[PDB]
Design a protein around this ligand. Structure first.
Ligand SMILES: NC(=O)c1ccc[n+]([C@@H]2O[C@H](COP(=O)([O-])OP(=O)(O)OC[C@H]3O[C@@H](n4cnc5c(N)ncnc54)[C@H](OP(=O)(O)O)[C@@H]3O)[C@@H](O)[C@H]2O)c1
Ligand SMILES: CN(Cc1cnc2nc(N)nc(N)c2n1)c1ccc(C(=O)N[C@@H](CCC(=O)O)C(=O)O)cc1
Ligand SMILES: [Ca+2]
Ligand SMILES: [Ca+2]
Length: 159
């Protein structure tokens, strides 16, 4: 299946000036745990903010232009992106804004981190209805030494 994984703040803010504006180690671990051994799909701007392939995962980058780095697999369309992922149980779509928008109607699961931080973004997660998504897991955690904000993990399954 196709799954989306994303950290959101207030107003579903996901990013600002090509970066993510918070400090949350608990989220990185959760991300690593749910994506390791999976193919990961991302847009070119998200690729350019990471710059090294996500190790232990097949890396597929969407771009309308020819690839500029042979450590990763480049694809020119959403259908080419899914085909390059081959026959796996779960393909992870990991950002950014424009990529989430395109894959959201094809997705069966969402893994979300709701971070209780009020920041300004120039990129937002698509608007999603509970009419379509059932919550099968959610945990809330208070801020601590490593994590400056409270945050909750949730897994939703399409209805
Ligand atoms: N909060 C999170 O969990 C999270 C996760 C990841 C990223 N982010 C943030 O999201 C922001 C980047 O988001 P973004 O929406 O600007 O960019 P993005 O979605 O990462 O990348 C957009 C680019 O991807 C390519 N692309 C997307 N769809 C394509 C398609 N269907 N066919 C061909 N190319 C396609 C295009 O590249 P060309 O111009 O080369 O054609 C497009 O300009 C950053 O601030 C990043 O930090 C947040
Ligand atoms: C820019 N970016 C995208 C990113 C970050 N956190 C996310 N968190 C969630 N929940 N969802 C995402 N899509 C997501 N995406 C990043 C930034 C750093 C690393 C990163 O290097 N993660 C390490 C974890 C260990 C470390 O950060 O040093 C890894 O190897 O997976 C990955 C993606
Ligand atoms: Ca580097
Ligand atoms: Ca059902």
């Amino acid at each position: 299946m196709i799954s989306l994984i994303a950290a959101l703040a207030v107003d579903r803010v996901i990013g600002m000036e090509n970066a993510m504006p918070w400090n949350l180690p608990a989220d990185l671990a959760w991300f690593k745990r749910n994506t390791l051994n999976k193919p990961v799909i991302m847009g070119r701007h998200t690729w350019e903010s990471i710059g090294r392939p996500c190790p232990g995962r097949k890396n597929i980058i969407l771009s309308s232009q020819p690839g500029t780095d042979d450590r990763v697999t480049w694809v020119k369309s959403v259908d080419e992106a899914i085909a390059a992922a081959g026959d796996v149980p779960e393909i992870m779509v990991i950002g950014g804004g424009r990529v989430y928008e395109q894959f959201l109607p094809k997705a069966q699961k969402l893994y979300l981190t709701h971070i209780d931080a009020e920041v300004e973004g120039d990129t937002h997660f698509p608007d999603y209805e509970p009419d379509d998504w059932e919550s099968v897991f959610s945990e809330f955690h208070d801020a601590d030494a490593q994590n400056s904000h409270s945050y909750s993990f949730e897994i939703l399954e399409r209805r």
